[PDB]
Design an enzyme around this catalytic site. Structure first.
Site, short mmCIF file in Angstrom:
data_model
loop_
_atom_site.label_atom_id
_atom_site.label_comp_id
_atom_site.label_asym_id
_atom_site.label_seq_id
_atom_site.Cartn_x
_atom_site.Cartn_y
_atom_site.Cartn_z
N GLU A 281 -122.56 0.22 -78.46
CA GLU A 281 -123.61 0.54 -79.42
C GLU A 281 -123.61 -0.41 -80.62
OE1 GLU A 281 -126.00 2.48 -78.35
OE2 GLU A 281 -124.69 2.71 -76.60
N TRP A 284 -125.26 -3.38 -79.34
CA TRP A 284 -126.74 -3.24 -79.32
C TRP A 284 -127.36 -3.71 -80.65
CZ3 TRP A 284 -130.27 -2.95 -75.59
CH2 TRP A 284 -129.88 -2.48 -74.34
N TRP A 312 -155.56 0.04 -77.71
CA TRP A 312 -154.95 1.21 -78.33
C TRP A 312 -156.05 2.10 -78.86
CZ3 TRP A 312 -150.32 1.35 -76.67
CH2 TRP A 312 -149.57 0.17 -76.53
N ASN A 347 -130.82 9.16 -81.82
CA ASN A 347 -131.37 8.05 -81.02
C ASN A 347 -132.19 8.47 -79.80
OD1 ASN A 347 -131.53 5.07 -80.16
ND2 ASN A 347 -130.63 6.06 -78.35
N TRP A 365 -147.79 0.63 -81.25
CA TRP A 365 -146.37 0.77 -81.61
C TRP A 365 -146.04 0.27 -83.02
CZ3 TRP A 365 -143.70 -3.68 -82.74
CH2 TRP A 365 -144.17 -4.89 -82.18
N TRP A 388 -138.59 -0.42 -80.75
CA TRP A 388 -140.02 -0.13 -80.51
C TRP A 388 -140.59 -0.97 -79.36
CZ3 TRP A 388 -143.03 3.78 -81.86
CH2 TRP A 388 -142.60 4.62 -82.91
C1 LIG Z 1 -137.77 3.65 -81.90
C2 LIG Z 1 -136.39 3.32 -82.41
C3 LIG Z 1 -136.21 2.79 -83.69
C4 LIG Z 1 -134.95 2.48 -84.18
N1 LIG Z 1 -134.79 1.97 -85.44
C5 LIG Z 1 -133.55 1.64 -85.91
C6 LIG Z 1 -133.32 1.07 -87.25
O1 LIG Z 1 -134.30 0.84 -88.00
N2 LIG Z 1 -132.04 0.80 -87.63
C7 LIG Z 1 -130.98 1.03 -86.82
O2 LIG Z 1 -129.82 0.76 -87.19
N3 LIG Z 1 -131.13 1.54 -85.58
C8 LIG Z 1 -132.34 1.88 -85.08
N4 LIG Z 1 -132.46 2.43 -83.79
C9 LIG Z 1 -131.26 2.58 -82.97
C10 LIG Z 1 -130.47 3.87 -83.00
O3 LIG Z 1 -131.35 4.97 -82.72
C11 LIG Z 1 -129.74 4.06 -84.32
O4 LIG Z 1 -128.92 2.94 -84.61
C12 LIG Z 1 -128.88 5.32 -84.23
O5 LIG Z 1 -129.73 6.47 -84.15
C13 LIG Z 1 -127.99 5.41 -85.45
O6 LIG Z 1 -127.16 6.58 -85.42
P1 LIG Z 1 -125.56 6.40 -85.46
O7 LIG Z 1 -125.17 5.47 -86.58
O8 LIG Z 1 -124.94 7.75 -85.50
O9 LIG Z 1 -125.27 5.68 -84.05
P2 LIG Z 1 -123.90 5.57 -83.20
O10 LIG Z 1 -124.20 6.19 -81.87
O11 LIG Z 1 -122.72 6.07 -83.97
O12 LIG Z 1 -123.83 3.99 -82.95
C14 LIG Z 1 -123.06 3.12 -83.80
C15 LIG Z 1 -123.91 1.98 -84.35
O13 LIG Z 1 -124.44 1.17 -83.30
C16 LIG Z 1 -125.73 0.69 -83.69
N5 LIG Z 1 -126.70 1.13 -82.66
C17 LIG Z 1 -126.58 2.22 -81.88
N6 LIG Z 1 -127.62 2.33 -81.02
C18 LIG Z 1 -128.43 1.27 -81.24
C19 LIG Z 1 -129.69 0.79 -80.68
N7 LIG Z 1 -130.30 1.48 -79.69
N8 LIG Z 1 -130.21 -0.35 -81.19
C20 LIG Z 1 -129.60 -1.03 -82.19
N9 LIG Z 1 -128.43 -0.64 -82.75
C21 LIG Z 1 -127.82 0.48 -82.32
C22 LIG Z 1 -126.01 1.23 -85.07
O14 LIG Z 1 -125.65 0.24 -86.04
C23 LIG Z 1 -125.11 2.44 -85.14
O15 LIG Z 1 -124.75 2.83 -86.48
C24 LIG Z 1 -133.77 2.73 -83.30
C25 LIG Z 1 -133.97 3.26 -82.03
C26 LIG Z 1 -135.21 3.57 -81.55
C27 LIG Z 1 -135.34 4.13 -80.15
#
Ligand SMILES: Cc1cc2nc3c(=O)[nH]c(=O)nc-3n(C[C@H](O)[C@H](O)[C@H](O)COP(=O)(O)OP(=O)(O)OC[C@H]3O[C@@H](n4cnc5c(N)ncnc54)[C@H](O)[C@@H]3O)c2cc1C
Ligand SMILES: Nc1nc(=O)c2c([nH]1)NC[C@@H]1CN(c3ccc(C(=O)N[C@@H](CCC(=O)O)C(=O)O)cc3)CN21
Length: 482
Positions: A281, A284, A312, A347, A365, A388
């Site tokens: 993650e 990612w 759209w 997420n 989007w 997105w």
């Molecule tokens: C439509 C959409 C918009 C999003 N917008 C953002 C945003 O603006 N900023 C953002 O940080 N994340 C975004 N995400 C990714 C992800 O949903 C969030 O990082 C996550 O919800 C953060 O919660 P957490 O810190 O508890 O994640 P954890 O599960 O604890 O993951 C640890 C870290 O990994 C990174 N991470 C995890 N999943 C993703 C992912 N899918 N993409 C990129 N990085 C990831 C984050 O830095 C996160 O803090 C988005 C996802 C979607 C589907």
């Protein structure tokens, strides 16, 4: 100071942006190594800064915390607003500083701003040095074994997993040398970063403590807590199974190297699969920045230009219903309400609400991206745009556009007992799990018993799943004929 005068060292300016931490901060460490007075400054730039209202709330508290931490070390944080070049030149002139340092920012617009500024300052004989820290990898240098950008997650993950451990995090300096006279600073309160009346962020503090100390508290709690069972728990939004590090990472209050290193040496208590999944993650985030570097228009242009002619819907009413969590699809509504209340969203639910907007409502989007920019404390120019686009069907890791799941089924799969829905849509609290994700299919007797009147207590679905699905697939067929 007259006849036994040591030759003094010039000051050094440390320009803070989205790196609001003292720990694992190579720019700050460079300033300490440089010697002489350290002049920390945060500039309110025109282009860069918080992506929206929720992040402005975050920034206020982050700056307050950083200021406090700097003062504990004997320093201060100078606040300034306007043109960065003019502000830096004025600070240089006043203090006699011979060096400006900063931590690199890897969003293309910020990197370009820095490149231009660096050349201008160097042309006038100033030393300017920039440092890594925001990312584990260098997007401009890392390539596939065959010399390409990474376009696909798994090989990129394998490269970062297989690389030498990121360097362990450096300690924060405990003391900073101060100038005899500090440059004047603006007052944080005058920046109007906080809500006033109403305080719509009143519940943000239930979840968040912006700043470095808060970041380390989140990391510590996760390592000693939810890291255990993370792989299995992270898919289920009712479960508090994730780290909640995202806004701390976005604000640079903790480095990804510090997060990674914190997962080392845990085999006595933690399963390798949980650590591997959490590391993925983190990667990612890296990958999103890789894609943004290689495609700077990630937030505004389709990665796959075949979607450019997609038609759209012009339906601002449905868009508004989406933003308010009044779609009549409980899992979607729960997510949008969570976002409004706490400045974040699970997420899995982000994927569900994004898909609902793009496919069920057929809304651009970019509108969803912009809404998230204003409402997420973790809004990130790479991760928001990238995610997105994947939901929208662009990219090697994108789900094909024609894959359209029912939010109801997604809700029942990832929130079977309805606990997440009940938390954020409490008017549905009394419904049994049979109907919690589809109150519109429930019989009059059950709705009556649960105290739910559809159209008053909770809305009817704003679109029928079947009809929405047909409409989206017809729109997909139309774009192919272009
Ligand atoms: C439509 C959409 C918009 C999003 N917008 C953002 C945003 O603006 N900023 C953002 O940080 N994340 C975004 N995400 C990714 C992800 O949903 C969030 O990082 C996550 O919800 C953060 O919660 P957490 O810190 O508890 O994640 P954890 O599960 O604890 O993951 C640890 C870290 O990994 C990174 N991470 C995890 N999943 C993703 C992912 N899918 N993409 C990129 N990085 C990831 C984050 O830095 C996160 O803090 C988005 C996802 C979607 C589907
Ligand atoms: N996560 C998140 N939650 C929010 O509530 C939120 C964001 N982000 N980002 C910024 C917007 C803007 N915020 C606002 C700003 C003003 C009013 C306001 O003045 N409301 C008046 C009546 C007018 C109205 O509701 O539009 C009020 O007192 O109710 C409400 C919310 C809420 N915002």
């Amino acid at each position: 100071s007259s006849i036994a005068s040591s030759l003094k060292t010039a000051p050094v300016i440390v320009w803070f942006r989205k790196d609001l931490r003292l720990s694992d901060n190579l720019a700050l460490l460079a300033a300490v190594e440089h010697g002489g007075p350290v002049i920390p400054v945060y500039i309110r730039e025109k282009s860069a800064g918080p992506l929206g209202g929720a992040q402005e709330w975050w920034l206020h508290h982050s700056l307050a915390a950083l200021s406090s931490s700097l003062e504990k070390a004997g320093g201060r944080l100078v606040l300034a607003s306007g043109d960065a070049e003019r502000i830096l030149r004025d600070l240089i002139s006043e203090t006699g500083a011979d060096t400006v340092v900063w931590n690199r920012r890897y969003d293309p617009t910020g990197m370009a701003t820095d490149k231009a500024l660096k050349q201008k300052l160097r042309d006038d004989g100033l030393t300017v040095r920039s440092f890594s820290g925001q990312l584990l990898h260098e997007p401009s240098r890392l390539q596939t074994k065959s010399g390409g950008p990474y376009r696909v997650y798994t090989p990129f993950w394998r490269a970062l997993e297989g690389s030498d451990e990121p360097h362990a995090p450096a300690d924060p300096p405990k003391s900073l040398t101060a100038p005899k006279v500090w440059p004047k600073s603006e007052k944080l309160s005058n920046w109007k970063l906080l809500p006033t009346k109403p305080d719509w962020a009143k519940d943000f503090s239930d979840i968040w403590t912006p700043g470095e100390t808060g970041a380390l508290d989140k990391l510590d709690d996760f390592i000693d807590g939810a890291l255990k069972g993370y792989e299995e728990g992270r898919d289920f939004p009712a479960k508090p199974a994730t780290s909640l590090l995202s806004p701390h990472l976005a604000a640079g209050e903790i480095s990804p190297a510090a997060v990674w290193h914190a997962t080392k040496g845990l085999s006595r208590h933690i399963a390798s699969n949980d650590i591997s999944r959490f590391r993925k993650e983190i990667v990612w985030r890296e990958f999103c920045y890789h894609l943004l570097f290689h495609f700077p228009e990630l937030g505004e242009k389709n990665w796959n230009d075949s979607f450019d002619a997609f038609s759209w819907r012009d339906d601002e009413k449905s868009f508004k219903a989406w933003t308010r969590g009044m779609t009549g699809y409980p899992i979607v509504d729960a997510g949008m309400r969570q976002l409004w209340q706490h400045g974040t969203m699970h997420n899995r639910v982000r994927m569900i609400v994004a898909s609902f907007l793009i496919k069920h409502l057929l809304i651009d989007w970019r509108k969803g991206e912009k809404w998230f920019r204003d409402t997420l404390v973790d809004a990130d120019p790479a991760s928001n745009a990238a995610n997105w686009q994947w939901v929208a069907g662009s990219g090697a890791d994108a789900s094909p556009f024609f894959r359209i799941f029912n939010p109801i089924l997604q809700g029942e799969k990832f929130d079977g007992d309805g606990d997440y829905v009940r938390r954020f849509v409490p008017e549905l609290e009394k419904l049994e799990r049979k109907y919690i994700h589809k109150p519109f299919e429930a019989p009059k007797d059950a709705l009556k018993k649960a105290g739910v009147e559809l159209g008053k207590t909770y809305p009817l679905p704003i679109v029928d799943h079947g009809k929405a699905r047909e409409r989206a697939l017809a729109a997909y067929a139309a774009v192919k004929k272009t």
